[PDB]
UniProtKB/Swiss-Prot annotation:
Gene Ontology BP terms: 'de novo' IMP biosynthetic process
Protein's name according to its UniProt entry: Phosphoribosylaminoimidazole-succinocarboxamide synthase
Keyword ATP-binding included in the entry's annotation: yes
InterPro entries with a match to the protein in the record: SAICAR_synt/ADE2_N, SAICAR_synth, SAICAR_synthetase_CS
The protein's annotated pathway: Purine metabolism; IMP biosynthesis via de novo pathway; 5-amino-1-(5-phospho-D-ribosyl)imidazole-4-carboxamide from 5-amino-1-(5-phospho-D-ribosyl)imidazole-4-carboxylate: step 1/2
Keywords, comma-separated and alphabetical: ATP-binding, Ligase, Nucleotide-binding, Purine biosynthesis
The protein's Enzyme Commission number: 6.3.2.6
Family designation: Belongs to the SAICAR synthetase family.
């Protein structure tokens, strides 16, 4: 119950599209989720109320589910967390981050599908003929990418590229852990009626050289969430979380031409989206979001 510090007491160190990172001390960071939401590669003007809190709750749930070491350095109510960001910020260990976007795909969609349609391959994996949109990939594929321009899409790379980034043995480890963790999480979600079609992890290494899962894990921003009840290979699957937002923006009311920066969302669309996040979280975790901490 020690008096919580102000966020202004920490040094702001980086800023992403919907996340923020603060230095707490030499060895610790504060990892903050905002209520911002992105669609069609735009951060939208309208925040989704409680999104940050809900996605934080989701990450914490999955870190608990998985056996691999992770960057969490205290509980979700740790006194080092400012009141202002309570429930949407975690106290974490500083790590030497490995510059590889560790992506697993259990299903063929997005840039993976496009690469396959162009080349017959994805990230060095030569796939069977006859696959298409939302085809199941079994075993799941390790489809690493690297971050690029401020700017552009992530660049899909092959295993050799990853070896050149982190070392042969470490690259093998990245591959193995990514597939293992995705496979476990995917089966868990599916059992609850939610497909995790793919996911992106970042790992770092601690002072001793151990691999440590960082960043956020298995959120609908880092993973494609689909409703299993409606899964049909061969057609584009709806985003579990973002479909109401997408339909509104590209629909009759928005007055926005997606083929040529989107307008604000109706409040009713934002509240409905908040409800979809809570549904995803509760169904997957078996927990109640009402028990999740807040200011
Ligand atoms: Cl993709
Ligand atoms: Mg997050």
């Amino acid at each position: 119950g020690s008096m919580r510090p102000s966020l202004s007491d920490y040094q702001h160190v980086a800023s992403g599209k919907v996340r923020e990172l603060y230095r707490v001390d030499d060895e610790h960071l504060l990892f903050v989720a905002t209520d911002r939401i992105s669609a069609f590669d735009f951060v939208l003007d309208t925040p989704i109320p409680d999104k940050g809190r809900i996605l934080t709750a989701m990450s914490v749930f999955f870190f608990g589910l998985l056996t691999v070491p992770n960057h969490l350095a205290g509980p979700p109510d740790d006194p080092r967390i400012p009141e202002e960001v309570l429930g949407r910020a975690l106290l974490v260990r500083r790590l030497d981050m490995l510059p590889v976007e560790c992506v697993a795909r259990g299903y063929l969609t997005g840039s993976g599908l496009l690469d396959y349609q162009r080349t017959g391959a994805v990230c060095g994996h030569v796939l069977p003929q006859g696959l298409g949109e939302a085809s199941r990939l079994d075993p799941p594929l390790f489809t690493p990418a690297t971050k690029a321009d401020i700017g552009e899409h992530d660049m899909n790379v092959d295993f050799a590229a990853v070896v050149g980034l982190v070392g042969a043995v470490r690259a093998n480890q990245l591959r193995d852990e990514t597939i293992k963790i995705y496979t476990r999480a995917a089966a868990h979600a599916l059992h609850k009626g939610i497909i995790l079609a793919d996911t992106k992890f970042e790992f770092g290494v601690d002072i001793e050289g151990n691999l440590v899962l960082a960043d956020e894990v298995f959120t609908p921003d880092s993973s494609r969430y689909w409703d299993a009840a409606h899964y049909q290979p061969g057609v584009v699957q709806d985003s579990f979380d973002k479909q109401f937002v997408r339909n509104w923006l590209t629909g009759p009311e928005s007055g926005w031409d997606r083929a040529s920066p989107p307008p604000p969302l109706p409040d009713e669309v934002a509240v409905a989206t908040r409800e979809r996040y809570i549904e995803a979280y509760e169904r997957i975790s078996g927990l109640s979001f009402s028990d999740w901490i807040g200011p």
